[PDB]
Design a protein around this ligand. Structure first.
Ligand SMILES: [Mn+2]
Ligand SMILES: [Mn+2]
Lengths: 51, 51
């Protein structure tokens, strides 16, 4: 349950951060968003790492 | 509105990660959940720098 809802939310985050990073024009902002996006992708990977 | 939705999502994630960390009976997995929770807190901090 918890893990699945977390996975769902991480997927939502990846989608939103990708879109946001693509809409951003200020390179510093784009960079911050891409950095967070990488983190969420990492979380997704980490969640797929269980038992 | 996208930054706002990102913030909302980060809070949802933080909620669920704290709950999951409190319910975790496997120490390794608990450790990972805590690391992720900290990352999300960091993401909120980073989001405040691009508003
Ligand atoms: Mn995450
Ligand atoms: Mn996050």
């Amino acid at each position: 349950d918890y893990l699945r809802e977390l996975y769902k939310l991480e997927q939502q985050a990846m989608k939103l951060y990708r879109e946001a990073s693509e809409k951003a024009r200020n390179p510093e902002k784009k960079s911050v968003l891409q950095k967070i996006l990488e983190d969420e992708e990492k979380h997704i990977e980490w969640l797929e790492t269980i038992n």
